[PDB]
Amino acid sequence: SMDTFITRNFQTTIIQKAKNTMAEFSEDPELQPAMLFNICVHLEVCYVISDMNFLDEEGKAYTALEGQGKEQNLRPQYEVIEGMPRTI
């Protein structure tokens, strides 16, 4: 089972954003899971590069901690354009 694989290994956010971008390109995830994986991996890798890399008031690159509130760090170093709806 291919569908069962992509469910367990990947995150719930990553799956949805992939299936929604596949729908925008008029492709069916439940019938063509070959594309579903490649988008999920490509999104995961994109999020790996962006994750926890922020910019402070002087414009310098620091990394945050999984726990620190979303009030402290407001400006990520990267803008993840991949995964967003076409028009956004």
Partner: protein
């Protein structure tokens, strides 16, 4: 000496003075009270023309169904619905021969357009029957109430954006064992009143949820709303008209789009062509037939009228037409095109408000609704109604509706019915007889040109055409049709006499104050004059008098007489002050008590543009104030488009050129119903408006270009404002504190939307 107005026709040919025969300064006829009498007439007549066909019970709705198609051929000259499939198919085959690849081309274009068509397309319709409230609402309202109600039954095909997945939900909804929908019910509060009855009933409508069974829903989805046609010209007696639901509109759109593609390429179609393009086409067709007349022979023109057109045409025939037209098409598209005719084949007519019974002695009146139509003995109805209801019985449903399988009461297949008419014209000859026929077809209107050796042989062709039409379910009116040697005829109220003559009277009611606003109405008024000079033979003397008449009407309508006039009025009091306070009075608009400077040469120039350089900079500053409170949220339609109502035809939109100013206002929505509190309905309207305005605040292009996306409005608005904020902070337009507040607020919004 006694004047006789008909004596004009001694000195002037009737066509040359045809305008004088149109009494379009008179009041057009309006209906009063119920349309049930007229609707029941249609239900009875429609069944009278098919009664010799197959009668059976629908195993879906339990309705009484009549099928005249492939029925017995008529033995009289009464309206016949007994169309022979074979003859229809032979007519369409002969069209396919004369237009090779047209049927597949039309089917391809129509299919490709459908694959590109989005759900919002259905908002471009007029008044639509809303099955959720069992009343007529605008197309955009009926669509919304259907989409939102469909969500309560796990039907979210609308969210995909394309028409096809929405249309998939529409046919799939017929399978749902029960349908939950958003309806409206009103709370009654009995108040005191200064009248005979002594009291009052104040209603407060509120949004509710209502549940209906599958059969109940199917009946609603198949149902037509019926009312009487008001302000129709050239007719002594009123007639019933019908409005279809929102469900069928998507399917009809594609079938009409298919028929349009065919009609466009048919030499004898007067549809979808209109105005000057039609005139040229007809004039060419007349010149052809004149030159192609056998020498020593005669050419004759039938000024053609069809009778019971809609009553006799049959959805089952259109179902066959869609089938034969989409021959070489993908099964899905053939199946798509098949649905509109199938829904019409099983359509149910709502019978309106019912009949009113009264006591002249006790001075009492009561409305008997359609469900209760047989709750009283038929002796208590008048002779006409007693007869109607007796003939209605077999087609009557318990819930006050009627089964109406045959006929096309709603219309909506004007192009496809034209294709059928052009099919008949396309036959040209029967049995290799010594005549040829051709013509023009615009829906139920036709002109037939017949060429032969003598008029006796021409009449044989007309008789063969008459008979051929009966086989397609088309009934030529012998009462309203007439024939003569080619040179003159009438077609869709256009009059030919060695060329098309002007018919000024047809356009006369359109010269009045349109009733959009004082800005638009000025442009519209002047444009109508300009266009009637070009098209409808209005000379310079009449054109100039029209300018005067229009300004007279405008000044009295908008109470905006000349500042130097001594006319009493609340507006006039301030106009008189504005007149005194202003130096450049030539610059003042007619609506501001200013002078009229319009003449023939400048009819096409917006009034503000004409007067701009003559205006006082204080007046010009006020008039054109960019943030004035009279102009609301303007749509691209709002500025350019205006619905103009001709004497003859459907209500069409016309373009006008006007500068946006304080006169470009809009009247309050008709939320002024007696003893009704609309507070709930108004809040719903204001909620959608708030959401749409704020969306336009984030996306300024929305007003101009249609926004695209299957994602939430909120998701789009949040992402935009998040970027706005970040790039306002990193540019130094927004302060560090404001950015923190913004991103904090956006964090709460981000949570609410997931």
């Amino acid at each position: 000496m006694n004047i006789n107005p008909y004596f004009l026709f001694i000195d002037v040919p009737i066509q040359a003075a045809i305008s004088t025969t149109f009494p379009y300064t008179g009041v057009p006829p309006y209906s009063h009270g119920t349309g049930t009498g007229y609707t029941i007439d249609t239900v009875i007549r429609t069944h009278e023309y098919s009664n010799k066909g197959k009668q059976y019970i629908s195993d879906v709705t339990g309705c009484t169904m009549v099928d005249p198609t492939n029925g017995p051929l008529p033995e009289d000259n009464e309206p016949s619905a007994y169309a022979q499939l074979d003859c229809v198919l032979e007519a369409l085959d002969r069209m396919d021969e004369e237009h090779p690849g047209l049927f597949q081309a039309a089917s391809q274009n129509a299919m490709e357009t459908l694959m590109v068509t989005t759900v919002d397309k259905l908002t471009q319709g007029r008044q639509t029957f809303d099955w959720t409230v069992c009343r007529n609402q605008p197309a955009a309202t009926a669509l919304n109430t259907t989409i939102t109600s469909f969500r309560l039954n796990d039907l979210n095909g609308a969210d995909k954006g394309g028409l096809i997945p929405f249309c998939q939900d529409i046919i799939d909804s017929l399978d749902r064992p029960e349908m939950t929908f958003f309806s409206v019910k009103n709370i009654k509060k009995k108040l005191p009143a200064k009248n005979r009855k002594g009291f009052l009933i104040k209603r407060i409508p509120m949004k509710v949820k209502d549940k209906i069974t599958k059969v109940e829903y199917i009946k609603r989805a198949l149902s037509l709303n019926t009312m009487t046609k008001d302000a129709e010209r050239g007719k002594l007696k009123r007639r019933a008209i019908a409005t279809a639901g929102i469900q069928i509109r998507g399917f009809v759109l594609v079938v009409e789009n298919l028929a349009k593609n065919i009609c466009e390429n048919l030499e004898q179609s007067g549809l979808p062509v209109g105005g000057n393009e039609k005139k040229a086409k007809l004039s060419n067709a007349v010149a052809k037939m004149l030159s192609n007349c056998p020498p020593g022979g005669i050419s004759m023109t039938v000024t053609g009228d069809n009778t019971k057109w809609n009553e006799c045409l049959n959805p089952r025939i259109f179902l066959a037409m869609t089938e034969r037209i989409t021959r070489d098409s993908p099964i899905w598209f053939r199946d798509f095109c098949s649905i509109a005719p199938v829904l019409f084949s099983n359509k149910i007519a709502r019978l309106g408000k019912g009949f009113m019974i009264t006591s002249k002695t006790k001075r009492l009146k009561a409305q008997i609704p359609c469900p209760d139509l047989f709750s009283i003995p038929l002796e208590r109805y008048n002779e006409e109604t007693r007869a109607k209801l007796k003939k209605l019985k077999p087609f009557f449903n318990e819930e006050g509706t009627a089964s109406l399988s045959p006929g096309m009461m709603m219309g909506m297949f004007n192009m496809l019915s034209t294709v059928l008419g052009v099919a008949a014209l396309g036959i040209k000859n029967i049995g290799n007889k010594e005549y040829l026929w051709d013509g023009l077809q615009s829906s139920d209107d036709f002109a037939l040109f017949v060429n032969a050796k003598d008029e006796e042989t021409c009449m044989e062709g007309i008789n063969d055409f008459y008979r051929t039409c009966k086989l397609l379910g088309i009934n030529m009116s012998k009462k309203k049709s007439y024939c003569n040697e080619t040179g003159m005829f009438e077609f869709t109220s256009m009059f030919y006499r060695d060329g098309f003559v002007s018919n000024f009277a047809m356009e006369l009611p359109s010269f009045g104050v349109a009733g959009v606003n004082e800005s638009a109405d000025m442009a519209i008024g002047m444009t109508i004059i300009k266009n009637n000079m070009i098209n409808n033979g209005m000379g310079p003397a009449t054109a100039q008098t029209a300018i005067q008449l229009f300004i007279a009407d405008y000044r009295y309508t908008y109470k905006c007489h000349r500042g130097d006039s001594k006319v009493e009025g609340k507006r006039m009091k301030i106009i008189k002050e504005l007149w005194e306070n202003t130096k450049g009075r030539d610059g003042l608009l007619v609506a501001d008590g200013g002078p009229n400077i319009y003449n023939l040469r400048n009819l096409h120039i917006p009034e503000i543009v004409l007067k701009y350089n003559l205006m006082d900079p204080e007046y010009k500053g006020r008039l054109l104030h960019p943030q004035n409170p009279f102009v609301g949220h303007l749509s691209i339609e709002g500025i350019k488009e205006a619905d103009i109502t001709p004497a003859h035809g459907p209500v069409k939109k016309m373009d006008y050129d006007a500068v946006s100013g304080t006169h470009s206002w809009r009247t309050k929505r008709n939320r002024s119903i007696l003893n009704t509190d609309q507070r709930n309905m108004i809040l719903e309207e204001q909620c959608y408006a708030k959401c749409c305005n704020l969306f336009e605040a984030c996306f300024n292009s929305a007003s101009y270009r249609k926004p695209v996306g299957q994602h939430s409005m909120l998701e789009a608005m949040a992402h935009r404002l998040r970027m706005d904020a970040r790039l306002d902070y990193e540019s130094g337009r927004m302060s560090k504190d404001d950015f923190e507040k913004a991103m904090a607020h956006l964090g709460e919004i981000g949570y609410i939307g997931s």
